[PDB]
Design a binder for this molecule. Structure first.
Ligand SMILES: [Mg+2]
Ligand SMILES: [Mg+2]
Ligand SMILES: [Mg+2]
Ligand SMILES: [Mg+2]
Ligand SMILES: [Mg+2]
Ligand SMILES: [Mg+2]
Ligand SMILES: [Mg+2]
Ligand SMILES: [Mg+2]
Ligand SMILES: [Mg+2]
Ligand SMILES: [Mg+2]
Ligand SMILES: [Mg+2]
Ligand SMILES: [Mg+2]
Ligand SMILES: [Mg+2]
Ligand SMILES: [Mg+2]
Ligand SMILES: [Mg+2]
Ligand SMILES: [Mg+2]
Ligand SMILES: [Mg+2]
Ligand SMILES: [Mg+2]
Ligand SMILES: [Mg+2]
Ligand SMILES: [Mg+2]
Ligand SMILES: [Mg+2]
Ligand SMILES: [Mg+2]
Ligand SMILES: [Mg+2]
Ligand SMILES: [Mg+2]
Ligand SMILES: [Mg+2]
Ligand SMILES: [Mg+2]
Ligand SMILES: [Mg+2]
Ligand SMILES: [Mg+2]
Ligand SMILES: [Mg+2]
Ligand SMILES: [Mg+2]
Ligand SMILES: [Mg+2]
Ligand SMILES: [Mg+2]
Ligand SMILES: [Mg+2]
Ligand SMILES: [Mg+2]
Ligand SMILES: [Mg+2]
Ligand SMILES: [Mg+2]
Ligand SMILES: [Mg+2]
Ligand SMILES: [Mg+2]
Ligand SMILES: [Mg+2]
Ligand SMILES: [Mg+2]
Ligand SMILES: [Mg+2]
Ligand SMILES: [Mg+2]
Ligand SMILES: [Mg+2]
Ligand SMILES: [Mg+2]
Ligand SMILES: [Mg+2]
Ligand SMILES: [Mg+2]
Ligand SMILES: [Mg+2]
Ligand SMILES: [Mg+2]
Ligand SMILES: [Mg+2]
Ligand SMILES: [Mg+2]
Ligand SMILES: [Mg+2]
Ligand SMILES: [Mg+2]
Ligand SMILES: [Mg+2]
Ligand SMILES: [Mg+2]
Ligand SMILES: [Mg+2]
Ligand SMILES: [Mg+2]
Ligand SMILES: [Mg+2]
Ligand SMILES: [Mg+2]
Ligand SMILES: [Mg+2]
Ligand SMILES: [Mg+2]
Ligand SMILES: [Mg+2]
Ligand SMILES: [Mg+2]
Ligand SMILES: [Mg+2]
Ligand SMILES: [Mg+2]
Ligand SMILES: [Mg+2]
Ligand SMILES: [Mg+2]
Ligand SMILES: [Mg+2]
Ligand SMILES: [Mg+2]
Ligand SMILES: [Mg+2]
Ligand SMILES: [Mg+2]
Ligand SMILES: [Mg+2]
Ligand SMILES: [Mg+2]
Ligand SMILES: [Mg+2]
Ligand SMILES: [Mg+2]
Ligand SMILES: [Mg+2]
Ligand SMILES: [Mg+2]
Ligand SMILES: [Mg+2]
Ligand SMILES: [Mg+2]
Ligand SMILES: [Mg+2]
Ligand SMILES: [Mg+2]
Ligand SMILES: [Mg+2]
Ligand SMILES: [Mg+2]
Ligand SMILES: [Mg+2]
Ligand SMILES: [Mg+2]
Ligand SMILES: [Mg+2]
Ligand SMILES: [Mg+2]
Ligand SMILES: [Mg+2]
Ligand SMILES: [Mg+2]
Ligand SMILES: [Mg+2]
Ligand SMILES: [Mg+2]
Ligand SMILES: [Mg+2]
Ligand SMILES: [Mg+2]
Ligand SMILES: [Mg+2]
Ligand SMILES: [Mg+2]
Ligand SMILES: [Mg+2]
Ligand SMILES: [Mg+2]
Ligand SMILES: [Mg+2]
Ligand SMILES: [Mg+2]
Ligand SMILES: [Mg+2]
Ligand SMILES: [Mg+2]
Ligand SMILES: [Mg+2]
Ligand SMILES: [Mg+2]
Ligand SMILES: [Mg+2]
Ligand SMILES: [Mg+2]
Ligand SMILES: [Mg+2]
Ligand SMILES: [Mg+2]
Ligand SMILES: [Mg+2]
Ligand SMILES: [Mg+2]
Ligand SMILES: [Mg+2]
Ligand SMILES: [Mg+2]
Ligand SMILES: [Mg+2]
Ligand SMILES: [Mg+2]
Ligand SMILES: [Mg+2]
Ligand SMILES: [Mg+2]
Ligand SMILES: [Mg+2]
Ligand SMILES: [Mg+2]
Ligand SMILES: [Mg+2]
Ligand SMILES: [Mg+2]
Ligand SMILES: [Mg+2]
Ligand SMILES: [Mg+2]
Ligand SMILES: [Mg+2]
Ligand SMILES: [Mg+2]
Ligand SMILES: [Mg+2]
Ligand SMILES: [Mg+2]
Ligand SMILES: [Mg+2]
Ligand SMILES: [Mg+2]
Ligand SMILES: [Mg+2]
Ligand SMILES: [Mg+2]
Ligand SMILES: [Mg+2]
Ligand SMILES: [Mg+2]
Ligand SMILES: [Mg+2]
Ligand SMILES: [Mg+2]
Ligand SMILES: [Mg+2]
Ligand SMILES: [Mg+2]
Ligand SMILES: [Mg+2]
Ligand SMILES: [Mg+2]
Ligand SMILES: [Mg+2]
Ligand SMILES: [Mg+2]
Ligand SMILES: [Mg+2]
Ligand SMILES: [Mg+2]
Ligand SMILES: [Mg+2]
Ligand SMILES: [Mg+2]
Ligand SMILES: [Mg+2]
Ligand SMILES: [Mg+2]
Ligand SMILES: [Mg+2]
Ligand SMILES: [Mg+2]
Ligand SMILES: [Mg+2]
Ligand SMILES: [Mg+2]
Ligand SMILES: [Mg+2]
Ligand SMILES: [Mg+2]
Ligand SMILES: [Mg+2]
Ligand SMILES: [Mg+2]
Ligand SMILES: [Mg+2]
Ligand SMILES: [Mg+2]
Ligand SMILES: [Mg+2]
Ligand SMILES: [Mg+2]
Ligand SMILES: [Mg+2]
Ligand SMILES: [Mg+2]
Ligand SMILES: [Mg+2]
Ligand SMILES: [Mg+2]
Ligand SMILES: [Mg+2]
Ligand SMILES: [Mg+2]
Ligand SMILES: [Mg+2]
Ligand SMILES: [Mg+2]
Ligand SMILES: [Mg+2]
Ligand SMILES: [Mg+2]
Ligand SMILES: [Mg+2]
Ligand SMILES: [Mg+2]
Ligand SMILES: [Mg+2]
Ligand SMILES: [Mg+2]
Ligand SMILES: [Mg+2]
Ligand SMILES: [Mg+2]
Ligand SMILES: [Mg+2]
Ligand SMILES: [Mg+2]
Ligand SMILES: [Mg+2]
Ligand SMILES: [Mg+2]
Ligand SMILES: [Mg+2]
Ligand SMILES: [Mg+2]
Ligand SMILES: [Mg+2]
Ligand SMILES: [Mg+2]
Ligand SMILES: [Mg+2]
Ligand SMILES: [Mg+2]
Ligand SMILES: [Mg+2]
Ligand SMILES: [Mg+2]
Ligand SMILES: [Mg+2]
Ligand SMILES: [Mg+2]
Ligand SMILES: [Mg+2]
Ligand SMILES: [Mg+2]
Ligand SMILES: [Mg+2]
Ligand SMILES: [Mg+2]
Ligand SMILES: [Mg+2]
Ligand SMILES: [Mg+2]
Ligand SMILES: [Mg+2]
Ligand SMILES: [Mg+2]
Ligand SMILES: [Mg+2]
Ligand SMILES: [Mg+2]
Ligand SMILES: [Mg+2]
Ligand SMILES: [Mg+2]
Ligand SMILES: [Mg+2]
Ligand SMILES: [Mg+2]
Ligand SMILES: [Mg+2]
Ligand SMILES: [Mg+2]
Ligand SMILES: [Mg+2]
Ligand SMILES: [Mg+2]
Ligand SMILES: [Mg+2]
Ligand SMILES: [Mg+2]
Ligand SMILES: [Mg+2]
Ligand SMILES: [Mg+2]
Ligand SMILES: [Mg+2]
Ligand SMILES: [Mg+2]
Ligand SMILES: [Mg+2]
Ligand SMILES: [Mg+2]
Ligand SMILES: [Mg+2]
Ligand SMILES: [Mg+2]
Ligand SMILES: [Mg+2]
Ligand SMILES: [Mg+2]
Ligand SMILES: [Mg+2]
Ligand SMILES: [Mg+2]
Ligand SMILES: [Mg+2]
Ligand SMILES: [Mg+2]
Ligand SMILES: [Mg+2]
Ligand SMILES: [Mg+2]
Ligand SMILES: [Mg+2]
Ligand SMILES: [Mg+2]
Ligand SMILES: [Mg+2]
Ligand SMILES: [Mg+2]
Ligand SMILES: [Mg+2]
Ligand SMILES: [Mg+2]
Ligand SMILES: [Mg+2]
Ligand SMILES: [Mg+2]
Ligand SMILES: [Mg+2]
Lengths: 275, 48
RNA sequence: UGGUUCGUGGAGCCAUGGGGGAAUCUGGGCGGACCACCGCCUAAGGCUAAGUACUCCGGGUGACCGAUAGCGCACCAGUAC
RNA sequence: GAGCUAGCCCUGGCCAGGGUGAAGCUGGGGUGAGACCCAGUGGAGGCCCGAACCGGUGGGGGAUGCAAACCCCUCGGAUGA
RNA sequence: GAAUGCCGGCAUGAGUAACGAUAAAGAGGGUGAGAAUCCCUCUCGCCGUAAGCCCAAGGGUUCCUACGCAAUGGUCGUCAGCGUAGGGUUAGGCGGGACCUAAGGUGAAGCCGAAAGGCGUAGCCGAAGGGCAGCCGGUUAAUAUUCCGGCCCUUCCCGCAGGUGCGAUGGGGGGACGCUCUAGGCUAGGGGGACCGGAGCCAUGGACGAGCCCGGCCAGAAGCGCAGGGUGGGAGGUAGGCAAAUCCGCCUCCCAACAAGCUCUGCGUGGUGGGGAAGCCCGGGUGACAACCCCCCGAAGCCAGGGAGCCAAGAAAAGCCUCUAAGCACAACCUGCGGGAACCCGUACCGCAAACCGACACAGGUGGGCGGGUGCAAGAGCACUCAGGCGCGCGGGAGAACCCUCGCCAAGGAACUCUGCAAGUUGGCCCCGUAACUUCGGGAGAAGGGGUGCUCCCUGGGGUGAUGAGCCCCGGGGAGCCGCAGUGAACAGGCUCUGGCGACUGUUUACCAAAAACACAGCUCUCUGCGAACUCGUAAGAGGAGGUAUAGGGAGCGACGCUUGCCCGGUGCCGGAAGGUCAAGGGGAGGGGUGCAAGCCCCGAACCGAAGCCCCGGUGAACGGCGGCCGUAACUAUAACGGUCCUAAGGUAGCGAAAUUCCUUGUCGGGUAAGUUCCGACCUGCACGAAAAGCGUAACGACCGGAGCGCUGUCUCGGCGAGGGACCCGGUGAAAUUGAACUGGCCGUGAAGAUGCGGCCUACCCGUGGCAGGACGAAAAGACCCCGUGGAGCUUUACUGCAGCC
RNA sequence: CGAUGUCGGCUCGUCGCAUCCUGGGGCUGAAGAAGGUCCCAAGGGUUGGGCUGUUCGCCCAUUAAAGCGGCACGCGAGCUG
RNA sequence: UGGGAGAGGGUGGUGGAAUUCCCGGAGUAGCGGUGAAAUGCGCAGAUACCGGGAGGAACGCCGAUGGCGAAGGCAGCCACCUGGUCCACCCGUGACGCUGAGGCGCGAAAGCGUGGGGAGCAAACCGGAUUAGAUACCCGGGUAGUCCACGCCCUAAACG
RNA sequence: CCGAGGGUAGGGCCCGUGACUGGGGCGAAGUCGUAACAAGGUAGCUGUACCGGAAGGUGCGGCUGGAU
């Protein structure tokens, strides 16, 4: 449930914050954090290559286990569920009976105290990871590897999930969170369940300052600029676009598809996204 | 008001210093020229 | 594509980024598309004095200057600033 | 050339005093249970007033200046983008 | 002889402006050739969250002393941050290095690029972050945590003794972290004392007093005490912590658990060592054998790595502890003691400024710490004042105009003016009281009003004590006293009504614009399946993101409410294995050059041959667009209705003389005595209209209109007063500008606006204070305008090309 | 065009006279009072306010009257802006 | 205390028929639609036929002049949770009752907010017809909505 | 002290009036259509919603107070 505020300042009138209800441990695991090196949107040449970044809260990176096939057959206890600033999902602390500790992204319904496992024989239950080929068609699934042993790449965002639709040869067919229909190899791991924190999308930032805390610096309209700067720049008074709406670099930005044409994975995409 | 010169010894050595000039083709050519010109100081005087 | 006087021209020659791809003198390249004839020359390895260029340096000489000239500097100047 | 200025990055520092009184929590009431109401407690906020500090609203002065942008009065922000 | 030429010299303006904050001076004494300006004394004023003190930058001898005054100093100079010389900076414990790492930089491996070079996990460098051992006092002209004195401490080497499986760059723990709020106990600092110590004082009407005035501490090992911080112990199992591990992790069991224990720090005490006032004598002596005590206030500092709450979720690495590995176990390491050893650089002085950044001894700019007392509710605000520091490096007179800054003003009260611009008014605190509207927070300090000093008497609660006294905090009730006046000085909102725009706090054109502009939460379209799209880069490599469609890019719109209509013919984008066109290349009917020939060489039709384009469809919060004429209704007027041309379709809701309305001050209504503005309406909207969004909207605004009350020198309409200038005398002494000048008025004339020409008129020679009509006054080779086959920024369905993409 | 600052206002005037008022006069379709119309006359006078940047103009309240023009559409080294 | 019938209510699962779209196959000149047509779709291969898949919605036969509920209403099947009601026994309580201004709850559909979901249907809207005209009826399209969760709205020929 | 009332300021309720505007009643000698009454020529009515010169239409659900 998202948390509202009474309108005791102009901004609190709309601000909503997450409830943090699932959260049970308020400090990360010391040996599982490392500093996040903040970039500001600058590459190694020092140049802004992604605009409007910088200035957010300091963050420690929590190391996440996006492999999991790494420790087949060894079970673990879900020790805690925690906040992670580097992602929308919460993360779950796993105590393996081995004694190793790792983090995973926390699926909807993971209970602290429960046990999870990975491998071809794992029970089809929330929290477990198996190759896709051993997961019943119809099951909703998250953190999916896109190619075997390359790490979880799909459905990691708060609330997201993928569903297994069918099988074909060495591949299963997934419905991605976008609704794309795609073949993913049978040997790729996925974890049963959807990602938690599904209310994430209902948060209302509420004020300029909150975007600022997120490291998101103000974004300025091409329309508010000059011709040296942008296709929409200039004109006396306000102006309509005056040409097909364009990015600062001139490419058209309402409809122009941009996926590379001859791309090898086209062969594995069955149906481009919906809506 | 605050003007443009705000001396900083470290800044001065790290920017115009002999080692900085030597690191780069442009700086080495600055030294080539200033030697050819007969400059008494090839590099800004700075105290350390 | 460049080089040549040659700017696509009738455009050869020399060179070569791409593709194809030989032969050993009865071999090959050239004489301005091409062909014949008649000649010239030996590619795909390397070196080679001298005669040539310059003047930081030394000397000699001016129908060259003579301290606003002549070098930016005749003087502690690439200095003071 | 970023010792000015602009943005970002790493690491530190600063923000008198006063006011308002969110959520929560406790208690009382209420009900089938509730919602909810009251009190106390609490101490939220690009909240309020106002120094430092950061500004530069209106006016006057200055105008071969004290100053190649200053001075006086006034005024904006002042836990936050 | 001219180039607003170039370099230099010297004039003019001119003994003119100015001499750099309006904090301020006066006198006596000294010194010296010379004194407002240097020294000393007394008096006066100014700063005192500083204009005092300590650090860091930067500066670089400016420090101290002697001897000097040409120049430097806005005057003077005997003085000085100036000239000459001589002296002066002392560290194992402060800071940095021989320690750690951050961003970043560099960079074995490796990757990339015509060259130069660009990258790059490790490593290395890199600090104002981590880590690490010194406090108090004394001494010099000038250094002192550095020398001295006292009491403490660190590492390294060697040794002795006791202990122990010792050993590391490898494993682990730890180091180790936010913001707001905050407890207990301390300390810093401060106030009081009838107590303690002290030179002395009794004035001028009174006082020999519980009088006045001054001071009443600092540092300190172990031990002890108080207050906090950190931390469970034992056993068994073990497959994880890229070897090993008894360590750490994980499971189980036993004992302990808001305790204790162990440990670390703060504070108190503590052997000892220091300091020690006023005043009085000449920095020093005395005071003094100084006293060195009690109470109160009390941190933002300390215990600390404390506590709670919150979301935006808050460095690393070494030191250090532990584990084991090669090894080694006569070693090694730990603990205690002893002896020896302990390097390099900085240290003067300025440091909110006359020594730093501003060309200047420049009213500007410059990070951190300390920053006393009283009173005003609080405070770092305000006034005064301590310590300490200053009177700002020209002065002396005078008492015009005018200017600046300031004070008052009869009657009036916005009549001023573009405008209440400016200045008044209001003003803190306590209490009463407070509207529309509202998103229920607010609007609100709405508005408006009362109180406010001192004296006496009665009385309530809290802190510290002890439960009491004293001290400190928060009050209540009663009776009075004085003045024009009690936040008696200083600091401290004028208010209301009503529209436009923008939701809001924010941001901006450094130096003419702070806004209605930008941003903003939020809404929508669109791209993107991840070696993402996208951006930078020739590339490698990076950003995106150690993210993954609840995400990332781009675009418009801009809280919120109610909404967002019709047109897809053109352009864009999307989709469309047909068809048309379509390059290289394929193909080779047919043809040609040459040769006696085989042959060599050239042209070449059909036909096959991509993207793109054409073509077919979709698509508007994609670019965009959203009509005209004729007729018709019981009088006129109009036209619900009919007809007709045109178009891709003809503007919906809502709004409308508007931030848009030309005609225009439209018309009507409101407000005013009067209203080109303002508000409300109407609708023939020159030329609104739905995300270049439409219409509204509480709250907000140094935004822009209109009105009212309050109050005023804004004004009728001006007067007086103050100080700083202006003026006069001494000192120092610019500037732009300047063809030369012996430089009047009129009417004419003249290249059309004459001191300079004609005619007349007027006029003795030369200044000083003032005014600005002229010298087409000065400044700036007009910025508007045009011209130049001049330049540059920007645009596109101009031309041509290139990157990029297909 | 190697610069002649440009509307309005304020301030300060000064001049013309085709006179707004005041003084003198002729004609009158001048009984009187009050007008009209022309002539002479420039000595002096010629108000305060609402609107608007306005000049102009309209309006309110008065007046003997509420004149029109010139002076670089007088006057920015005099101010405003 | 024994028993009973029932689409009474809530949750979670879950089955087959059909429609639509996509994929594969096979096939060709029309299909569709009306009173008749036209728009529309179709040689860029539609309709009709076979196989595969996706997704939402409603549950045919049983079915009734049936049943359940206070009403609004409720219908494939399964389980769990849960209300009402009837019967028999004549065992317990001992008038503990009726109605009920206010209040509280529930309340078809449409509609509204936030988020899902979207096959068929379908306001608005485009187009074809009909017609004197035809902002309609009929035809081809088509967005909200119809569906789910949660919160609102609180109407009705909410009727016997 | 209290005190008629006066003055200042802010509120509440009611009456009158107002550019302009919304519908309503009526009149009737008009224009436009023909929604309801018959199966009223699309059964009607209905709550709601969107829409149209106008009666009205359509969607969803409901009622019969529906002809055959
Ligand atoms: Mg809220
Ligand atoms: Mg709430
Ligand atoms: Mg508010
Ligand atoms: Mg608000
Ligand atoms: Mg949670
Ligand atoms: Mg949750
Ligand atoms: Mg943390
Ligand atoms: Mg670590
Ligand atoms: Mg990282
Ligand atoms: Mg780098
Ligand atoms: Mg970008
Ligand atoms: Mg950026
Ligand atoms: Mg999270
Ligand atoms: Mg969240
Ligand atoms: Mg949101
Ligand atoms: Mg953040
Ligand atoms: Mg954004
Ligand atoms: Mg923007
Ligand atoms: Mg703009
Ligand atoms: Mg602009
Ligand atoms: Mg640029
Ligand atoms: Mg451009
Ligand atoms: Mg452009
Ligand atoms: Mg444009
Ligand atoms: Mg334009
Ligand atoms: Mg523009
Ligand atoms: Mg314009
Ligand atoms: Mg425009
Ligand atoms: Mg613009
Ligand atoms: Mg435009
Ligand atoms: Mg546009
Ligand atoms: Mg356009
Ligand atoms: Mg792939
Ligand atoms: Mg600086
Ligand atoms: Mg430095
Ligand atoms: Mg430095
Ligand atoms: Mg530096
Ligand atoms: Mg250097
Ligand atoms: Mg030398
Ligand atoms: Mg150099
Ligand atoms: Mg030719
Ligand atoms: Mg050639
Ligand atoms: Mg080649
Ligand atoms: Mg041959
Ligand atoms: Mg050859
Ligand atoms: Mg030859
Ligand atoms: Mg030859
Ligand atoms: Mg030779
Ligand atoms: Mg040679
Ligand atoms: Mg000679
Ligand atoms: Mg000379
Ligand atoms: Mg020489
Ligand atoms: Mg020279
Ligand atoms: Mg010379
Ligand atoms: Mg020299
Ligand atoms: Mg030099
Ligand atoms: Mg920091
Ligand atoms: Mg603050
Ligand atoms: Mg709240
Ligand atoms: Mg709480
Ligand atoms: Mg605030
Ligand atoms: Mg505030
Ligand atoms: Mg102040
Ligand atoms: Mg100002
Ligand atoms: Mg002012
Ligand atoms: Mg001025
Ligand atoms: Mg200036
Ligand atoms: Mg000031
Ligand atoms: Mg102020
Ligand atoms: Mg603010
Ligand atoms: Mg403030
Ligand atoms: Mg504040
Ligand atoms: Mg703020
Ligand atoms: Mg000449
Ligand atoms: Mg000149
Ligand atoms: Mg000159
Ligand atoms: Mg010259
Ligand atoms: Mg010259
Ligand atoms: Mg003069
Ligand atoms: Mg002068
Ligand atoms: Mg001066
Ligand atoms: Mg003053
Ligand atoms: Mg003197
Ligand atoms: Mg003298
Ligand atoms: Mg003296
Ligand atoms: Mg210097
Ligand atoms: Mg010294
Ligand atoms: Mg001198
Ligand atoms: Mg002298
Ligand atoms: Mg001098
Ligand atoms: Mg002098
Ligand atoms: Mg000076
Ligand atoms: Mg002397
Ligand atoms: Mg000096
Ligand atoms: Mg020492
Ligand atoms: Mg050493
Ligand atoms: Mg290092
Ligand atoms: Mg350090
Ligand atoms: Mg010590
Ligand atoms: Mg010394
Ligand atoms: Mg950490
Ligand atoms: Mg830190
Ligand atoms: Mg005190
Ligand atoms: Mg003390
Ligand atoms: Mg083990
Ligand atoms: Mg003493
Ligand atoms: Mg003694
Ligand atoms: Mg803590
Ligand atoms: Mg690191
Ligand atoms: Mg040991
Ligand atoms: Mg050494
Ligand atoms: Mg040294
Ligand atoms: Mg020193
Ligand atoms: Mg000094
Ligand atoms: Mg200052
Ligand atoms: Mg300071
Ligand atoms: Mg100087
Ligand atoms: Mg001075
Ligand atoms: Mg200064
Ligand atoms: Mg006060
Ligand atoms: Mg106060
Ligand atoms: Mg003075
Ligand atoms: Mg005088
Ligand atoms: Mg007066
Ligand atoms: Mg008044
Ligand atoms: Mg008045
Ligand atoms: Mg005004
Ligand atoms: Mg005041
Ligand atoms: Mg009101
Ligand atoms: Mg309210
Ligand atoms: Mg008040
Ligand atoms: Mg008194
Ligand atoms: Mg004062
Ligand atoms: Mg105030
Ligand atoms: Mg108001
Ligand atoms: Mg307006
Ligand atoms: Mg604003
Ligand atoms: Mg704005
Ligand atoms: Mg708004
Ligand atoms: Mg907004
Ligand atoms: Mg804003
Ligand atoms: Mg500017
Ligand atoms: Mg500006
Ligand atoms: Mg500028
Ligand atoms: Mg300015
Ligand atoms: Mg501005
Ligand atoms: Mg502003
Ligand atoms: Mg802006
Ligand atoms: Mg904006
Ligand atoms: Mg919006
Ligand atoms: Mg890379
Ligand atoms: Mg990354
Ligand atoms: Mg991402
Ligand atoms: Mg904006
Ligand atoms: Mg509203
Ligand atoms: Mg179109
Ligand atoms: Mg189109
Ligand atoms: Mg176009
Ligand atoms: Mg042939
Ligand atoms: Mg168009
Ligand atoms: Mg458009
Ligand atoms: Mg008629
Ligand atoms: Mg329409
Ligand atoms: Mg209008
Ligand atoms: Mg009007
Ligand atoms: Mg309007
Ligand atoms: Mg318009
Ligand atoms: Mg108009
Ligand atoms: Mg007009
Ligand atoms: Mg008029
Ligand atoms: Mg106006
Ligand atoms: Mg106006
Ligand atoms: Mg009209
Ligand atoms: Mg735009
Ligand atoms: Mg607009
Ligand atoms: Mg504002
Ligand atoms: Mg403003
Ligand atoms: Mg005056
Ligand atoms: Mg006076
Ligand atoms: Mg005076
Ligand atoms: Mg005076
Ligand atoms: Mg005299
Ligand atoms: Mg002469
Ligand atoms: Mg002339
Ligand atoms: Mg003349
Ligand atoms: Mg003359
Ligand atoms: Mg003459
Ligand atoms: Mg005359
Ligand atoms: Mg003059
Ligand atoms: Mg003249
Ligand atoms: Mg003149
Ligand atoms: Mg020139
Ligand atoms: Mg010119
Ligand atoms: Mg020109
Ligand atoms: Mg022109
Ligand atoms: Mg031309
Ligand atoms: Mg020409
Ligand atoms: Mg040209
Ligand atoms: Mg150009
Ligand atoms: Mg692209
Ligand atoms: Mg001109
Ligand atoms: Mg000029
Ligand atoms: Mg002139
Ligand atoms: Mg008569
Ligand atoms: Mg006259
Ligand atoms: Mg006269
Ligand atoms: Mg006017
Ligand atoms: Mg007018
Ligand atoms: Mg008269
Ligand atoms: Mg004029
Ligand atoms: Mg003028
Ligand atoms: Mg002027
Ligand atoms: Mg003027
Ligand atoms: Mg002038
Ligand atoms: Mg003048
Ligand atoms: Mg002039
Ligand atoms: Mg004047
Ligand atoms: Mg065919
Ligand atoms: Mg019985
Ligand atoms: Mg009942
Ligand atoms: Mg309902
Ligand atoms: Mg419904
Ligand atoms: Mg509905
Ligand atoms: Mg019924
Ligand atoms: Mg009376
Ligand atoms: Mg009908
Ligand atoms: Mg009918
Ligand atoms: Mg009918
Ligand atoms: Mg019509
Ligand atoms: Mg319809
Ligand atoms: Mg019913």
């Amino acid at each position: 449930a998202v948390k509202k505020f009474k309108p005791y300042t102009p901004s609190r009138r709309f601000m909503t914050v997450a409830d943090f209800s699932e959260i049970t441990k308020t400090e990360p695991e010391k040996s599982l954090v490392k500093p996040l090196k903040k970039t500001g949107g600058r590459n190694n040449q020092g140049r802004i290559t992604v605009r409007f970044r910088g200035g957010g809260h300091k963050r420690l990176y929590r190391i996440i286990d996006f492999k999991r096939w790494d420790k087949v057959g060894i079970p673990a206890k879900v020790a805690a569920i925690e906040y992670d600033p580097n992602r929308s999902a919460r993360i779950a602390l796993l105590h393996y009976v081995d004694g190793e500790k790792r983090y995973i992204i926390a699926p909807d319904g993971l209970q602290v105290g429960q046990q999870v496992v990975a491998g071809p024989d794992a029970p089809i239950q929330v929290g477990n990871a198996l190759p896709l080929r051993f997961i019943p068609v119809g099951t909703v699934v998250h953190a999916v590897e896109l190619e075997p042993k390359k790490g979880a790449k799909l459905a990691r965002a708060a609330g997201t999930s993928a569903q297994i639709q069918g099988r074909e040869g060495d591949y299963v067919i997934l419905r991605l969170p976008s609704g794309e229909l795609r073949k993913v190899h049978g040997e790729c791991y996925a974890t049963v369940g959807a990602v938690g924190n599904a209310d994430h999308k209902n948060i209302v930032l509420g004020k300029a300052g909150r975007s600022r805390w997120l490291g998101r610096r103000p974004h300025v309209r091409g329309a508010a600029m000059n011709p040296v700067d942008h296709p929409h720049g200039g004109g006396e008074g306000r102006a309509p676009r005056g040409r097909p709406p364009a990015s600062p670099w001139g490419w058209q930005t309402k409809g122009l598809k941009t996926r590379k044409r001859r791309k090898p994975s086209s062969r594995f995409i069955i149906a481009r996204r919906k809506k | 008001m605050k003007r443009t010169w705000q001396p900083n010894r470290r800044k001065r050595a790290k920017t115009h210093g002999f080692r900085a000039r030597m690191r780069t083709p442009g700086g080495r050519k600055v030294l080539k020229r200033r030697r050819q010109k007969g400059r008494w100081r090839l590099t800004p005087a700075v105290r350390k």
